[PDB]
Amino acid sequence: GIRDKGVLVLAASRGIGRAVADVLSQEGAEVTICARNEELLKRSGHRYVVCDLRKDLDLLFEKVKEVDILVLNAGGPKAGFFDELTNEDFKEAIDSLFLNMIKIVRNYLPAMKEKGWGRIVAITSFSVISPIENLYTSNSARMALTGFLKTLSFEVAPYGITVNCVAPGWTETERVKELLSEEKKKQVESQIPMRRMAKPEEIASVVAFLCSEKASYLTGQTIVVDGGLSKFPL
């Protein structure tokens, strides 16, 4: 039940974030998205803020004041094996996937406490429980955030705020339909039990559910939505 709730979705001009904004809009929430590309944002049909999170967080906090539902999401950082990654690559990933996210929570959390209701949902990756061999930066940075949000979930629970992650597997975002060949996309598709990648709305729907009033007893969890790919049984 999310008619009239305030929603912010980060990195939401395209891909999963976009799909999440779309759903929540169709279920009557008042949604703001934010991203780097203004042109993409004007075309989205949503309320938007142009927001490079490294440089200018106070612009975001000024233009989007309070928020019942917060979906954390980011671009994926550099892939590579250990010798082709610098200290700067790990630092940038930590800043943008972990420390900047903490700042954003810290900002919007007090109004949720005051209302006695809230939702935080972080979009991470199934690579969190089934680490991919060349994603050193995002593996470790998403484990970081996932730990932070678990510890958080304990403290905010009594205020009616849930805190969860959704860990999508391979998703057919326009970004992925460019980072990969047809040969590589087939090979990967063939190791997914469902023998396909997710439509972005298939990830969106899980996130929309955790945001609804029906998910009120579910917190401190990472829901993996990956077609059956990861092997971990519990």
Ligand X SMILES: NC(=O)c1ccc[n+]([C@@H]2O[C@H](COP(=O)([O-])OP(=O)(O)OC[C@H]3O[C@@H](n4cnc5c(N)ncnc54)[C@H](O)[C@@H]3O)[C@@H](O)[C@H]2O)c1
Cα 40 from chain centre: 19
| Tokens encoding 112 | 């949720």
Distance CA(233)–CA(226), nearest Å, equals: 13
Distance CA(43)–CA(32), nearest Å, equals: 14
Which range of residues in 12-20, 36-44, 59-67, 154-162 is near a copy of itself by CB under 8 A? Answer: 154-162
10 is in an annotated binding site: no
Residues 41-60 contacting ligand X, CB under 6 A: 52-54
Q: Are 153 and 220 in contact (CB under 8 A)?
A: yes
Q: Which of 131, 176, 180, 188 binds a copy of itself (CB under 8 A)?
A: 131
- What is the smallest separation between the CB atom of 30 and a copy of itself, expressed in angstroms? 22
Mark residues 169-208: x for contact with a copy of itself by CB under 8 A, - for none.
x----------------------xxxx--xx--xx-xx--
- What is the smallest separation between the CB atom of 233 and a copy of itself, expressed in angstroms? 4
Q: Are 32 and 11 in contact (CB under 8 A)?
A: no
Angle among Cα 127, 19, 90 to the nearest 5 degrees reads 35
Distance CA(230)–CA(204), nearest Å, equals: 19
- What is the smallest separation between the CB atom of 4 and ligand X, expressed in angstroms? 25
- What is the smallest separation between the CB atom of 175 and ligand X, expressed in angstroms? 4
Which range of residues in 8-16, 45-53, 99-107, 179-187 is near a copy of itself by CB under 8 A? Answer: 99-107
